[PDB]
Structures are given as structure tokens and as C-alpha cells.
Design an enzyme around this catalytic site. Structure first.
Site, PDB file in Angstrom:
ATOM      1  N   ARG A  63      53.665  43.636 -34.185  1.00  0.00           N
ATOM      2  CA  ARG A  63      52.716  42.761 -34.918  1.00  0.00           C
ATOM      3  C   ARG A  63      51.720  43.642 -35.714  1.00  0.00           C
ATOM      4  O   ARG A  63      51.357  43.246 -36.818  1.00  0.00           O
ATOM      5  CB  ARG A  63      52.067  41.809 -33.899  1.00  0.00           C
ATOM      6  N   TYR A  64      51.287  44.801 -35.193  1.00  0.00           N
ATOM      7  CA  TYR A  64      50.273  45.693 -35.842  1.00  0.00           C
ATOM      8  C   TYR A  64      50.777  46.142 -37.223  1.00  0.00           C
ATOM      9  O   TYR A  64      49.963  46.467 -38.113  1.00  0.00           O
ATOM     10  CB  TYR A  64      49.960  46.955 -35.021  1.00  0.00           C
ATOM     11  CG  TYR A  64      51.145  47.847 -34.728  1.00  0.00           C
ATOM     12  CD1 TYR A  64      51.532  48.841 -35.614  1.00  0.00           C
ATOM     13  CD2 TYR A  64      51.902  47.675 -33.579  1.00  0.00           C
ATOM     14  CE1 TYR A  64      52.624  49.653 -35.357  1.00  0.00           C
ATOM     15  CE2 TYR A  64      52.988  48.486 -33.297  1.00  0.00           C
ATOM     16  CZ  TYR A  64      53.350  49.470 -34.196  1.00  0.00           C
ATOM     17  OH  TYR A  64      54.417  50.248 -33.923  1.00  0.00           O
ATOM     18  N   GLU A  66      53.947  49.048 -38.530  1.00  0.00           N
ATOM     19  CA  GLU A  66      55.030  50.020 -38.235  1.00  0.00           C
ATOM     20  C   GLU A  66      54.474  51.439 -38.147  1.00  0.00           C
ATOM     21  O   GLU A  66      53.518  51.778 -38.865  1.00  0.00           O
ATOM     22  CB  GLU A  66      56.088  50.015 -39.332  1.00  0.00           C
ATOM     23  CG  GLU A  66      56.817  48.694 -39.464  1.00  0.00           C
ATOM     24  CD  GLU A  66      57.706  48.591 -40.693  1.00  0.00           C
ATOM     25  OE1 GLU A  66      57.751  49.534 -41.495  1.00  0.00           O
ATOM     26  OE2 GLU A  66      58.343  47.524 -40.852  1.00  0.00           O
ATOM     27  N   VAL A  67      55.107  52.295 -37.338  1.00  0.00           N
ATOM     28  CA  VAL A  67      54.875  53.762 -37.409  1.00  0.00           C
ATOM     29  C   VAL A  67      56.175  54.455 -37.813  1.00  0.00           C
ATOM     30  O   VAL A  67      57.258  54.107 -37.261  1.00  0.00           O
ATOM     31  CB  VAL A  67      54.305  54.346 -36.111  1.00  0.00           C
ATOM     32  CG1 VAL A  67      54.083  55.846 -36.245  1.00  0.00           C
ATOM     33  CG2 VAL A  67      53.036  53.619 -35.730  1.00  0.00           C
ATOM     34  N   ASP A 104      41.205  49.839 -25.868  1.00  0.00           N
ATOM     35  CA  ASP A 104      42.608  49.419 -25.675  1.00  0.00           C
ATOM     36  C   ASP A 104      43.420  50.575 -25.074  1.00  0.00           C
ATOM     37  O   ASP A 104      44.525  50.870 -25.545  1.00  0.00           O
ATOM     38  CB  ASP A 104      43.199  48.866 -26.970  1.00  0.00           C
ATOM     39  CG  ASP A 104      44.500  48.116 -26.798  1.00  0.00           C
ATOM     40  OD1 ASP A 104      44.783  47.690 -25.681  1.00  0.00           O
ATOM     41  OD2 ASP A 104      45.180  47.989 -27.813  1.00  0.00           O
ATOM     42  N   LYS A 119      51.186  55.325 -39.885  1.00  0.00           N
ATOM     43  CA  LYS A 119      51.050  53.921 -39.461  1.00  0.00           C
ATOM     44  C   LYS A 119      50.760  53.070 -40.680  1.00  0.00           C
ATOM     45  O   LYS A 119      49.752  53.323 -41.361  1.00  0.00           O
ATOM     46  CB  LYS A 119      49.936  53.722 -38.450  1.00  0.00           C
ATOM     47  CG  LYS A 119      49.862  52.313 -37.907  1.00  0.00           C
ATOM     48  CD  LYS A 119      48.878  52.189 -36.787  1.00  0.00           C
ATOM     49  CE  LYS A 119      48.729  50.746 -36.361  1.00  0.00           C
ATOM     50  NZ  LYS A 119      47.810  50.631 -35.208  1.00  0.00           N
ATOM     51  N   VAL A 156      59.666  54.757 -36.060  1.00  0.00           N
ATOM     52  CA  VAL A 156      59.611  55.102 -34.612  1.00  0.00           C
ATOM     53  C   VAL A 156      58.845  54.023 -33.869  1.00  0.00           C
ATOM     54  O   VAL A 156      58.713  54.135 -32.664  1.00  0.00           O
ATOM     55  CB  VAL A 156      59.035  56.514 -34.394  1.00  0.00           C
ATOM     56  CG1 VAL A 156      59.907  57.570 -35.033  1.00  0.00           C
ATOM     57  CG2 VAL A 156      57.603  56.654 -34.898  1.00  0.00           C
TER      58      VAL A 156
HETATM   59  C1  LIG Z   1      50.070  54.590 -30.479  1.00  0.00           C
HETATM   60  O1  LIG Z   1      49.483  54.713 -31.791  1.00  0.00           O
HETATM   61  C2  LIG Z   1      50.035  55.575 -32.701  1.00  0.00           C
HETATM   62  C3  LIG Z   1      51.063  56.460 -32.437  1.00  0.00           C
HETATM   63  C4  LIG Z   1      51.572  57.338 -33.391  1.00  0.00           C
HETATM   64  C5  LIG Z   1      52.714  58.256 -33.056  1.00  0.00           C
HETATM   65  C6  LIG Z   1      52.495  59.602 -33.264  1.00  0.00           C
HETATM   66  N1  LIG Z   1      53.462  60.487 -32.953  1.00  0.00           N
HETATM   67  C7  LIG Z   1      54.625  60.048 -32.503  1.00  0.00           C
HETATM   68  C8  LIG Z   1      54.948  58.711 -32.322  1.00  0.00           C
HETATM   69  C9  LIG Z   1      56.354  58.409 -31.790  1.00  0.00           C
HETATM   70  C10 LIG Z   1      57.369  59.226 -32.284  1.00  0.00           C
HETATM   71  C11 LIG Z   1      58.700  59.014 -31.824  1.00  0.00           C
HETATM   72  C12 LIG Z   1      58.930  58.013 -30.895  1.00  0.00           C
HETATM   73  C13 LIG Z   1      60.320  57.750 -30.351  1.00  0.00           C
HETATM   74  C14 LIG Z   1      61.360  57.509 -31.455  1.00  0.00           C
HETATM   75  C15 LIG Z   1      62.584  58.457 -31.413  1.00  0.00           C
HETATM   76  N2  LIG Z   1      63.158  58.643 -30.049  1.00  0.00           N
HETATM   77  C16 LIG Z   1      64.247  57.662 -29.790  1.00  0.00           C
HETATM   78  C17 LIG Z   1      62.160  58.624 -28.950  1.00  0.00           C
HETATM   79  C18 LIG Z   1      60.762  58.929 -29.503  1.00  0.00           C
HETATM   80  C19 LIG Z   1      57.939  57.214 -30.415  1.00  0.00           C
HETATM   81  C20 LIG Z   1      56.583  57.422 -30.855  1.00  0.00           C
HETATM   82  C21 LIG Z   1      53.953  57.775 -32.627  1.00  0.00           C
HETATM   83  C22 LIG Z   1      54.199  56.295 -32.502  1.00  0.00           C
HETATM   84  C23 LIG Z   1      50.952  57.342 -34.604  1.00  0.00           C
HETATM   85  C24 LIG Z   1      49.930  56.410 -34.889  1.00  0.00           C
HETATM   86  O2  LIG Z   1      49.296  56.358 -36.133  1.00  0.00           O
HETATM   87  C25 LIG Z   1      49.846  57.151 -37.205  1.00  0.00           C
HETATM   88  C26 LIG Z   1      49.487  55.536 -33.946  1.00  0.00           C
HETATM   89  O3  LIG Z   1      48.489  54.657 -34.231  1.00  0.00           O
HETATM   90  C27 LIG Z   1      47.203  55.156 -34.206  1.00  0.00           C
END
Ligand SMILES: COc1cc(-c2cncc(-c3ccc(C4CCN(C)CC4)cc3)c2C)cc(OC)c1OC
Ligand SMILES: COc1cc(-c2cncc(-c3ccc(C4CCN(C)CC4)cc3)c2C)cc(OC)c1OC
Ligand SMILES: COc1cc(-c2cncc(-c3ccc(C4CCN(C)CC4)cc3)c2C)cc(OC)c1OC
EC number: 2.7.11.30
Length: 283
Positions: A17-18, A20-21, A133, A34, A13
Site C-alpha cells: 500500500r505504501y 514500492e522499493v 513504527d 522507495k 524488492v
Molecule cells: C523498510 O523500509 C525501507 C527499506 C529499504 C530497503 C533497503 N535495502 C534493501 C531492501 C531490500 C532489498 C532486497 C530484499 C529482498 C529481495 C531479493 N531477495 C529475494 C531477498 C532480498 C528485500 C529488501 C529494502 C526494502 C529502503 C527503503 O527506502 C528506500 C525503505 O523505506 C524507508
């Protein structure tokens, strides 16, 4: 007893550079995983060190589940596992959605609430924490319409921040680096920029602005440190308040609030607690 540690990685998702999640699954439940690049190992260490110091638990802070280090033949694998918010980041959400008054206020007050929780020292408790940040990509949207703050890889307890969101004292290197309150005031500047990003997407009188990032009109994509310093420090530009906001009492009040997050003098800026109080009296 059995310790079931296996997490199934289901879909990526986020990639940067950091690292992947991933959306993952543990015991039938979504988690976010992450996976850190070796280049950004210090972000995993700092967030882990903070959570080993204080187990933050707040509805507007992304919920910690685990920090894992796994030995590989030629490398170390670093994972941070958190709650999963299927709606994704505020940055993402504001591109595909406009807001009404209640949803705009609920978003910004929830962010203020998470930020005040980080900032304020609790005795007997938690140390004071500055984020360093804060930005819309580091805020997730929950199904109940509140947000939560993510990414404590730069956090300080009492990598550099994203340049677009850096306060003037960071850009001109006058920040008082030995003074913890300096770091809170840098977060407040960034909060004001996030409040501007959100407010633009609030409809009034049938009008809304398109999603844009702060300073979209005066700096390039991936703005340099110098590009930002010239705008913020030398010219002292601030984001535009559209005329249409002054027909709407909520946006009028939010414009005043964001102005009081953007003073050149860091000590003039509102505190997170004062921002919360002001937002509870709007509407
Ligand atoms: C910012 O930082 C961090 C974030 C997260 C995180 C937690 N829940 C959900 C997300 C996510 C889920 C789904 C989508 C999209 C993809 C599907 N669709 C097309 C639209 C939706 C985007 C984002 C994330 C990225 C976890 C982290 O660490 C484990 C992070 O780092 C600390
Ligand atoms: C090691 O690694 C991972 C472990 C787990 C996990 C799986 N089952 C059970 C547990 C568990 C929790 C807590 C106790 C307590 C019980 C009360 N007693 C007085 C003290 C001990 C025991 C067992 C855990 C922690 C999940 C993981 O991922 C989600 C792990 O990988 C990061
Ligand atoms: C890491 O994360 C998750 C962990 C678990 C989990 C698995 N086994 C055991 C536990 C546990 C049991 C009992 C205590 C004790 C502590 C002291 N005293 C004796 C009273 C209570 C603590 C811990 C947990 C919490 C479940 C989760 O989700 C359902 C987790 O979330 C993903």
C-alpha cells in the site's frame, strides 16, 4: 559542472500500500529507491522534513542519500533514495536463518544502538526522535551482521503505527499525546516484541522456535484495533517465553529484558540506553 541524477531501476524488492522499493544503480553503485503511493505522500514529507532538520548519520540507521520530487503532467512523483542492504529485512532474514548466541546479540544490540541514537537529544547535535513504527520489516540486515532501522515516515521530533506492534496506551487511547517521552516508551514496547521475534530464532541445546510474528497465536492476520486492544489491554497478554529459553543463560537474560519492555505502565519500561547497557553485559 555535470550533475548526474539518473538512477536505473533494476528490480522491485518490495511492493505494498505504501508504494514500492527498487534496487537501483547510480554511478555503478546499488541504491534503494522507495517510490511513494499518492495515498502515503505524508510519509515522504515527514521523512524529508526530518532529514532537512537533522542529517542523521549512524551505522544502525538506514543511510539517507536523497529525497526527490519530480513534476509529472497530472501527478507528483516522490522518491526516497537510501543505502541498499542486499540481505533485506530482519523479518525476511529470520524466516530463512537460525542464529547463534553471538549473531543474536549482535542483531539486537545494533537495533538498540540505532534506537538510542534516535531517542537521545544531542545539544550544540540533534533533536530527540521517536520512530513510531518499529517492527522487523522496518529493520534491514547488513553484511557485517549488524542491522539498521528504516522508515522515519511517522517519526516525531522533540498513517498510524502497525497495529500488531502497538503499545497498550496507544490501543486504549490513554497515551499522553503532548508528552514526548510517551512516544519513546511506545518504541520500547515495539522493541521488546522485535527482541522476542529474534530470540525465538537463536538455537540452544539443538532447539529453535519457528519464525512467528508477535501475537501470532492470539490475533488474526491484519488484526483489528479491537483484536489488539482485547489481547494487550483487556486481557494483558504478552508473548510466550518457551521453557527451553531457561536452560540457556543468554535467552534467560533476554527474556528478563523483553519483560521490562512490556510493562503496562509506560514509565516502568526500560530506556533504550539501559537496554544497550544490559545487552553489553550479556555473555
Ligand atoms: C523498510 O523500509 C525501507 C527499506 C529499504 C530497503 C533497503 N535495502 C534493501 C531492501 C531490500 C532489498 C532486497 C530484499 C529482498 C529481495 C531479493 N531477495 C529475494 C531477498 C532480498 C528485500 C529488501 C529494502 C526494502 C529502503 C527503503 O527506502 C528506500 C525503505 O523505506 C524507508
Ligand atoms: C539534484 O538531484 C540529484 C543530484 C545528485 C548529485 C549528483 N552529482 C553531484 C552532486 C553534488 C553534490 C554536492 C555538490 C557540492 C559541492 C561543494 N559545493 C561547495 C557545494 C555543492 C555538488 C554536486 C549531486 C548532489 C544525485 C542525485 O541522485 C543520487 C540527485 O537526484 C536525487
Ligand atoms: C548525494 O549522494 C552522493 C553525493 C556524492 C557527491 C557528488 N559530488 C560531489 C560531492 C561533494 C563534494 C564536495 C563537498 C564539499 C562540502 C563542503 N566543502 C567544500 C568540502 C566538501 C560536498 C559534496 C558529493 C558528496 C557522491 C556520492 O557517492 C559517491 C553520493 O552518494 C550516493
Amino acid at each position: 559542472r555535470t550533475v548526474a541524477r539518473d538512477i536505473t531501476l533494476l528490480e522491485c524488492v518490495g511492493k505494498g500500500r505504501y508504494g514500492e522499493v527498487w534496487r537501483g544503480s547510480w554511478q555503478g553503485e546499488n541504491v534503494a529507491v522507495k517510490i511513494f503511493s499518492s495515498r502515503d505522500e505524508k510519509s515522504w514529507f515527514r521523512e524529508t522534513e526530518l532529514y532537512n532538520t537533522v542529517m542523521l548519520r549512524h551505522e544502525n540507521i538506514l543511510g539517507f542519500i536523497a529525497s526527490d520530487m519530480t513534476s509529472r503532467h497530472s501527478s507528483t512523483q516522490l522518491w526516497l533514495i537510501t543505502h541498499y542492504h542486499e540481505m533485506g529485512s530482519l523479518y525476511d532474514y529470520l524466516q530463512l536463518t537460525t542464529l547463534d548466541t553471538v549473531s543474536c546479540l549482535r542483531i539486537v544490540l545494533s537495533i538498540a544502538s540505532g534506537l538510542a541514537h534516535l531517542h537521545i537529544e544531542i545539544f550544540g547535535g540533534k533533536p530527540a526522535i521517536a520512530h513510531r513504527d518499529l517492527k522487523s520489516k522496518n529493520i534491514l540486515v547488513k553484511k557485517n551482521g549488524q542491522c539498521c532501522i528504516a522508515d522515519l515516515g511517522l517519526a516525531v521530533m522533540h498513517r498510524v503505527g502497525t497495529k500488531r506492534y502497538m503499545a497498550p496506551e496507544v490501543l486504549d487511547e490513554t497515551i499522553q499525546v503532548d508528552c514526548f517521552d510517551s512516544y519513546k516508551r511506545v518504541d520500547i514496547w515495539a522493541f521488546g516484541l522485535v527482541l522476542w521475534e529474534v530470540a525465538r530464532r537463536m538455537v540452544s541445546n539443538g532447539i529453535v522456535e519457528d519464525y512467528k510474528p508477535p501475537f501470532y497465536d492470539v490475533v488474526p492476520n491484519d488484526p483489528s484495533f479491537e483484536d489488539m486492544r482485547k489481547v494487550v489491554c483487556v486481557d494483558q497478554q504478552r508473548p510466550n517465553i518457551p521453557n527451553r529459553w531457561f536452560s540457556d543463560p543468554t535467552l534467560t537474560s533476554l527474556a528478563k529484558l523483553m519483560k521490562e519492555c512490556w510493562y503496562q505502565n509506560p514509565s516502568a519500561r526500560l530506556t533504550a540506553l539501559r537496554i544497550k547497557k544490559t545487552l553489553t553485559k550479556i555473555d
